Design a protein around this motif. Sequence first.
Motif, short mmCIF file in Angstrom:
data_model
loop_
_atom_site.label_atom_id
_atom_site.label_comp_id
_atom_site.label_asym_id
_atom_site.label_seq_id
_atom_site.Cartn_x
_atom_site.Cartn_y
_atom_site.Cartn_z
N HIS A 194 0.87 -1.21 0.00
CA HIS A 194 0.00 0.00 0.00
C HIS A 194 0.90 1.24 0.00
O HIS A 194 1.72 1.36 0.89
CB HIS A 194 -0.97 -0.01 1.18
CG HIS A 194 -1.66 -1.31 1.39
ND1 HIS A 194 -0.98 -2.52 1.47
CD2 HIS A 194 -2.97 -1.61 1.57
CE1 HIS A 194 -1.84 -3.50 1.68
NE2 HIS A 194 -3.07 -2.97 1.75
N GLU A 235 -6.08 -3.31 7.56
CA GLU A 235 -6.28 -3.88 6.20
C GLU A 235 -5.37 -5.11 6.07
O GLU A 235 -5.90 -6.21 5.98
CB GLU A 235 -5.97 -2.86 5.10
CG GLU A 235 -6.83 -1.60 5.15
CD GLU A 235 -6.26 -0.44 5.94
OE1 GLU A 235 -5.93 -0.64 7.14
OE2 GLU A 235 -6.13 0.66 5.35
N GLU A 264 -6.86 -8.71 5.32
CA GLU A 264 -6.50 -9.37 4.04
C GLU A 264 -5.83 -10.73 4.32
O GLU A 264 -6.12 -11.67 3.58
CB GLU A 264 -5.63 -8.43 3.22
CG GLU A 264 -6.41 -7.20 2.81
CD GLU A 264 -5.69 -6.38 1.77
OE1 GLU A 264 -4.47 -6.10 1.99
OE2 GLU A 264 -6.32 -6.06 0.72
MN LIG Z 1 -5.15 -3.79 0.79
#
Ligand SMILES: [Mn+2]
Lengths: 162, 161
Positions: free
Chosen positions: A81, A151, A155
């Motif tokens: 990211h 996240e 994930e």
């Molecule tokens: Mn992600």
Amino acid sequence: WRHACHALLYAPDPGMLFGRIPLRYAILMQMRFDGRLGFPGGFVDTQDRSLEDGLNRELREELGEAAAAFRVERTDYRSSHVGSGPRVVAHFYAKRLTLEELLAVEAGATRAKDHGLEVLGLVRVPLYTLRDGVGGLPTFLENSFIGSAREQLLEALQDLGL
Amino acid sequence: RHACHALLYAPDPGMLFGRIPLRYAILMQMRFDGRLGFPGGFVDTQDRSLEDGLNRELREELGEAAAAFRVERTDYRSSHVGSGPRVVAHFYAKRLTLEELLAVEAGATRAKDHGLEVLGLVRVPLYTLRDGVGGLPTFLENSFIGSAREQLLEALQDLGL
Ligand SMILES: [Mn+2]
Ligand SMILES: Cc1cc2nc3c(=O)[nH]c(=O)nc-3n(C[C@H](O)[C@H](O)[C@H](O)COP(=O)(O)OP(=O)(O)OC[C@H]3O[C@@H](n4cnc5c(N)ncnc54)[C@H](O)[C@@H]3O)c2cc1C
Ligand SMILES: Nc1ncnc2c1ncn2[C@@H]1O[C@H](COP(=O)(O)O)[C@@H](O)[C@H]1O
Ligand SMILES: [Mn+2]
Ligand SMILES: [Mn+2]
Ligand SMILES: [Mn+2]
């Protein structure tokens, strides 16, 4: 520019909380120095030879000598990211360990260079939801998380079933 | 029915980032329910004293390092009742040496409740960063069990800030 690498370290657990609620895996997140939960690792500095060279460097510093009894390889890679605002691309990796390997990290983590400064302690992630339907994972996420760490986590839980 | 939880802390000379003074190392834990709270649990029948079920539940949760010091009535701080559960929660604060504390942290992974009731131990950050949100202000955003935060926030004023 400035790449950052952090690792999820996970070991499967046959243990049963309360002797009936199955744990499934031990997963290590850390309580950072800003009071936000996250993962072991951090900046890849200038004289690091590779993304992965630099990660194992930070694991040693934050987790201790026991983090050196394995190495995160290119193959443990999950995601990247881009932090736009603080111009930093942030890379994630998930390493499968034995529960013996993962316990040796926790037992050694209080002798870590960064113990009690950057790293206030290590926490396992509760995966179960409790009978009340809220105690466990659902609440664990209500806590405060640095950047994309929530996240990354969700994930990782997703990617591998859960 | 009664419950007992301890705040353990040590004079910490350390400086985060070689400038920010840490003052005291303060142990909380990450609970099985995904909330921050203090080591301790329910006192019951055979426990002669509140302090007996407490020290007992510290043995279970912090390992055979808490069999070095003992919390007694002198350490008492508060009793907050939780209306719904009907239970009376009692709070203490025990002063140790940084070496006594390091030795609890280091030992707590071989405790009965490690990876079950106790998911991990955390040091509270008593400082505040330049964004005035990093550190304690951010820490207190986390989930806590029953009157856990109030207990923390009251001990800090009564000594530590
Ligand atoms: Mn992600
Ligand atoms: C003297 C000194 C003072 C400092 N003062 C401050 C200060 O006041 N405030 C401050 O924030 N830092 C400060 N730092 C730097 C601090 O040590 C961090 O390196 C820096 O804040 C950015 O890294 P991080 O804390 O986010 O985590 P690091 O592990 O260093 O990671 C670096 C980058 O990765 C991100 N990151 C961290 N954890 C995760 C995760 N689990 N998943 C994904 N991304 C993640 C961070 O947002 C950051 O962009 C200071 C350093 C020094 C030497
Ligand atoms: N740190 C804490 N401070 C106050 N109450 C707590 C704390 N941790 C748990 N409790 C409550 O005290 C009782 C005993 O909790 P436990 O230690 O999990 O068995 C429960 O009813 C909880 O709601
Ligand atoms: Mn770092
Ligand atoms: Mn870091
Ligand atoms: Mn308890």
